[PDB]
Every structure is written in C-alpha cells, then in structure tokens.
Amino acid sequence: STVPLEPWTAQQLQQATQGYWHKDQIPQTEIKRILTDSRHAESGDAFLALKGERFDAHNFVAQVVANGCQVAIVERPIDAEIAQLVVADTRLALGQLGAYRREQNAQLKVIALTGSSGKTTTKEMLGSILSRLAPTLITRGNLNNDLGVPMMLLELRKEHQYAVMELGANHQGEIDYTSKIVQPHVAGILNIGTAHLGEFGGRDGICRAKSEIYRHILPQGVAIVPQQDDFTAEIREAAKSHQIMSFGEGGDVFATEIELLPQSANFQLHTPQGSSFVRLPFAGEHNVQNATAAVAFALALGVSLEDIVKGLEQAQGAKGRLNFIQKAPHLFIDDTYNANPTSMRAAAQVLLQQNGIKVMVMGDIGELGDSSWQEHHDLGRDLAELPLDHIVAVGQFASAALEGAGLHSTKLKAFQTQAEALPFLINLIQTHQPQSMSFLFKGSRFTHMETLMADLMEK
Numbered sequence: 001s002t003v004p005l006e007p008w009t010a011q012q013l014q015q016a017t018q019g020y021w022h023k024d025q026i027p028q029t030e031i032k033r034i035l036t037d038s039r040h041a042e043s044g045d046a047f048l049a050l051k052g053e054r055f056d057a058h059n060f061v062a063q064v065v066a067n068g069c070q071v072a073i074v075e076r077p078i079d080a081e082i083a084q085l086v087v088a089d090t091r092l093a094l095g096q097l098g099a100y101r102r103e104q105n106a107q108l109k110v111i112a113l114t115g116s117s118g119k120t121t122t123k124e125m126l127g128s129i130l131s132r133l134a135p136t137l138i139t140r141g142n143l144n145n146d147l148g149v150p151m152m153l154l155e156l157r158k159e160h161q162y163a164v165m166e167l168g169a170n171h172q173g174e175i176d177y178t179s180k181i182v183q184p185h186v187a188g189i190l191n192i193g194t195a196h197l198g199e200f201g202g203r204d205g206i207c208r209a210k211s212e213i214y215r216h217i218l219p220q221g222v223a224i225v226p227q228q229d230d231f232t233a234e235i236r237e238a239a240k241s242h243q244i245m246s247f248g249e250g251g252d253v254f255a256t257e258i259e260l261l262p263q264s265a266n267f268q269l270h271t272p273q274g275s276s277f278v279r280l281p282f283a284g285e286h287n288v289q290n291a292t293a294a295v296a297f298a299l300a301l302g303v304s305l306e307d308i309v310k311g312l313e314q315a316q317g318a319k320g321r322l323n324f325i326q327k328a329p330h331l332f333i334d335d336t337y338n339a340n341p342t343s344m345r346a347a348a349q350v351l352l353q354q355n356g357i358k359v360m361v362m363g364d365i366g367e368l369g370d371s372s373w374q375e376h377h378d379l380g381r382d383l384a385e386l387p388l389d390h391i392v393a394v395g396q397f398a399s400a401a402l403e404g405a406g407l408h409s410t411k412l413k414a415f416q417t418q419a420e421a422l423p424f425l426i427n428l429i430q431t432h433q434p435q436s437m438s439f440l441f442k443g444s445r446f447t448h449m450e451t452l453m454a455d456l457m458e459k
C-alpha cells in the first residue's frame with residue numbers, strides 16, 4: 001500500500017486462516033504487509049496467491065522470491081524456496097484475515113453502505129464529516145467487492161475511531177459475505193436504481209441482493225432506509241429487526257427549499273436534531289439526496305448537526321464523478337467513471353443547469369441484461385424531450401437511442417465509434433461561433449469516454 005500499516009505475526013495468520021505451514025517452516029520476522037501483486041512483493045511482505053479468471057498468482061511466486069519476499073499464503077504446496085501457509089482457498093482466507101483484523105479493533109465505529117448509485121459520493125461526504133473528529137478509514141477507490149473489502153480492512157489501526165466501508169453488489173450473496181466480514185454498527189441502502197440489471201435480472205433481484213446488508217448489523221445497531229424509493233416497503237421488512245432512521249420526504253432527515261446551482265446546491269436541512277442551512281458543493285438534486293443519507297448516517301453515529309454541516313460544506317467529489325473542468329471559454333463535465341440509466345438521467349439534469357450551448361456526449365451502458373437495447377431506446381426518448389441543444393451517442397446501442405428520439409430525432413447524433421464522433425464535436429464548436437459550450441461526457445467503464453474528452457480538449 002502507501003499508508004502505515006500494523007504488522008502481522010505468523011501465529012496471527014495461522015490462527016486467522018486456520019491453515020498450516022508447509023514443512024513447518026515458520027517466518028522468524030513479522031509480516032509488515034499482505035499484498036496480492038507479485039510486482040511489489042518485497043522483503044518483509046507476505047504474498048497472497050489468488051486464483052482468478054484470467055490469472056493464477058501461484059505462477060508468480062518465483063518472482064516474489066527473487067524480489068526478497070520470504071512468506072506466501074497459497075492453496076497448495078509449491079516447489080519454490082519460500083515459507084508457505086497452506087489454506088483451503090486463498091480467496092476466502094483473505095476475507096478471514098480481514099474479519100480477524102476487524103475483530104481485533106473493538107474501539108471502532110463502523111458504517112456499511114450500499115446502493116445502485118451514489119455509494120462513493122456518500123462515502124466521501126461521510127469521510128469528510130468524520131475525519132474532522134477522529135482518524136477515519138474509508139474505502140479507497142473501487143475496492144468494494146468480495147476481494148476489496150477485506151483488503152481495505154487490512155489497513156485498520158488502533159488510532160482509527162470510525163470506518164466507512166462501501167459495499168458493492170456485483171452478484172447475489174456478495175453483500176451478505178462482505179457485510180458479515182465488516183460487522184457494521186450502522187448500515188443501509190442509498191437507493192434501488194438500474195445498475196447491474198443483467199446480473200440480477202430485474203430491480204427485484206437488486207433489492208433482494210442489497211437487503212443482505214441488514215442481516216449482520218451488530219446489536220444496538222441502526223438500520224438506514226430510504227423513505228422515497230420504489231422498494232421502501234420491502235426494505236422496511238428487511239430491516240424490521242433493527243432501529244431505523246430514514247432519509248427523504250416524510251422521513252427523519254429531509255431537505256426543503258432546494259436551490260439548484262450550476263456547480264452546487266443550497267437547501268434547508270431538516271433533522272430530528274434540528275434544522276440548518278446547507279451550502280453543498282455538489283451539483284444535482286441526487287447529491288442532495290445523497291447528502292441527506294450521509295446526514296442520517298452521521299446522526300446514527302451520534303455526530304452533532306454542526307459538525308455534519310461543517311463536514312458537508314467542505315467535502316470533495318471523486319474522480320470521474322461530475323468533475324467540472326474549465327477550458328476557456330468552454331465547460332467540460334467529467335462524468336466518465338461509470339454509467340447507468342438513472343445516473344445518465346441525473347447527469348442530464350445537472351447539464352441543464354449550465355450556461356451556453358448544452359451538449360451531452362454519452363457512450364454505451366454496460367451490465368444491462370436483455371433490456372439493454374430497450375433501455376438505450378427509452379434513454380434516447382427522455383434525453384431528447386429535455387431542453388438539451390445536442391445529444392451525441394457513441395457505441396453499439398447509439399442507433400437504438402436515435403430511434404428512441406423519435407420526434408426529436410434531429411437533436412440526437414449517433415456514432416458507432418469515438419474516432420468518427422471526434423471530428424463532429426470539433427466542428428460542432430466552430431459551428432456555433434464564439435459562444436460558450438457545455439459538454440458533459442459520460443459512459444460505462446469499458447467505453448472510456450475520457451479518452452474522447454481528452455482528444456477533444458486537446459484539439
């Protein structure tokens with residue numbers, strides 16, 4: 001990693017994984033770090049060999065031996081000169097390590113949150129709030145799956161008072177596993193959207209898979225539910241065995257008198273601990289909703305409202321999530337990290353708040369099932385109805401979006417590739433003469449629309 005870590009002993013590893021040392025060779029030094037990348041495994045580390053879909057890290061042990069590493073956790077004895085802890089399955093063993101380390105840190109207050117969209121942002125808000133009070137460990141990057149969560153738990157220290165763990169649902173049963181490992185005091189769902197519609201086959205599967213986060217809330221724990229969501233009832237059932245705080249209109253925490261600004265939002269925050277005016281440095285109503293959720297979490301941890309507002313007003317967003325880039329006289333909105341129908345519609349709303357000729361450049365949307373084509377169609381139908389000047393679809397399902405435009409066909413341009421779309425944008429700037437433009441780039445991870453945004457910002 002990069003952060004100062006707390007060392008491991010051979011005994012702790014053996015106890016946690018319930019494995020055995022091959023040839024009884026036991027490391028005489030303390031394990032300073034557990035990693036899974038063979039390139040960075042040096043002397044003092046313990047290499048954890050994972051067997052993936054494209055890889056099998058067992059084939060790289062010689063490299064870590066050549067780089068000084070003398071300890072390794074494996075699924076089977078290897079002929080390499082290195083201390084080897086043999087376990088049933090290294091994947092599960094990593095989780096066991098994370099669980100073991102989390103248990104040893106009983107001085108912790110842990111938050112676990114999930115949702116179709118908004119997890120990283122709410123995690124950033126919560127991190128901003130809690131970090132002003134005490135040392136906090138929040139999920140770093142995309143490490144929110146069955147492998148990532150224990151990896152983040154391995155960074156736990158005794159100085160840490162709070163922990164905000166973002167939990168992603170890549171498939172059914174995942175959140176049950178990760179949440180069981182995390183052992184949260186406060187847990188909840190932000191929303192039930194349209195992400196990963198392919199894996200779960202319908203929003204009903206998403207709800208059922210995300211409701212797993214309530215099963216492993218520690219006693220005296222608090223469940224957080226959305227008040228205004230299509231599946232709020234099904235969630236209330238899943239969380240009936242805990243005390244519940246809700247966010248949204250009619251809930252415990254809500255927002256009124258919302259004033260939307262191009263790069264921010266001002267609103268009246270209402271909580272059971274009182275009311276306060278909030279200057280949120282995040283654009284869009286969806287980030288207001290996220291903010292209310294974060295507030296509900298912080299309150300559930302007993303944070304005072306003043307510290308919550310203080311934390312909110314100076315929070316910062318993650319890379320690729322509505323980042324405002326200024327390239328005079330034009331405006332570029334970097335929203336190219338990921339994409340789903342809901343977040344696309346939200347991004348469209350954010351773009352409507354801007355000045356000058358508004359143009360949205362969207363790519364394909366992944367992880368959708370058989371509904372994919374239809375989704376894009378409907379997307380093209382709802383984006384063209386909006387007061388957007390130009391819509392540029394790039395990818396396989398761009399054509400579909402064109403059909404979806406129907407009556408407003410002329411404001412939506414479809415392209416099969418980025419290379420073909422670039423010259424259109426270049427000329428698009430010139431066509432409208434000296435007049436500020438607002439471009440919003442968005443698309444799924446594999447579409448890497450930031451490449452197109454870069455090639456447009458250069459020329």
Ligand SMILES: Nc1ncnc2c1ncn2[C@@H]1O[C@H](COP(=O)(O)OP(=O)(O)OP(=O)(O)O)[C@@H](O)[C@H]1O
Binds near residue numbers: 120144286338346
């Ligand atoms: N409540 C929301 N509704 C709709 N869109 C949202 C919401 N919150 C965030 N978004 C959009 O979602 C995008 C990404 O959000 P974020 O990165 O916060 O999600 P994530 O939920 O961490 O994804 P992952 O599944 O990988 O963990 C942003 O571009 C933002 O505009």
Ligand SMILES: [Mg+2]
Binds near residue numbers: 196
């Ligand atoms: Mg996701």
Ligand SMILES: [Mg+2]
Binds near residue numbers: 144
């Ligand atoms: Mg994330």
